[PDB]
Symmetry: D2
Subunit: 47 residues, 4 copies
């Protein structure tokens, strides 16, 4: 249910942000695509 | 391109691992689903 | 030198943010405490 | 009490790993240095 609560994360440091933002993008995509793509992803490039 | 180079990450601590593990899944997914779903994701649940 | 550049990351979704926010805190901490604590941390709970 | 349980995370992909490993490093540090350093970090480079 908690997927639209805009939680701002002011990350001081560009390089630092690049890491975190990569995680937020990844989390947003995790919460985006079908659960089955995750299974197929598991056997695509995951371990 | 480095997406199939098995890099083991021994994460001591269950709760800790749970955080990283989802990140690795999220990253695996970032490199999995079509770039267009990421665009649509941007307008689905991203900011 | 990019460690003090405020890069806002609006993370929609509480649970999502909780993960990334802990990552930004963790990164901010990586970029804070003494380098020797990292060595000791490496052998404290890191692998 | 879950900070010393070795949970291996085989991250396929170097670039991917660099991100997650940075998270695990950061998480390990979060559970390492004193909670007061986090407070001071908060007002050192955190937002």
């Amino acid at each position: 249910s908690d997927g639209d609560v805009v939680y701002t994360l002011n990350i001081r440091g560009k390089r630092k942000f690049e890491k975190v933002k990569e995680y937020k993008e990844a989390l947003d995509l995790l919460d985006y695509v079908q659960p089955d793509v995750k299974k197929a992803c598991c056997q695509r490039n995951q371990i």
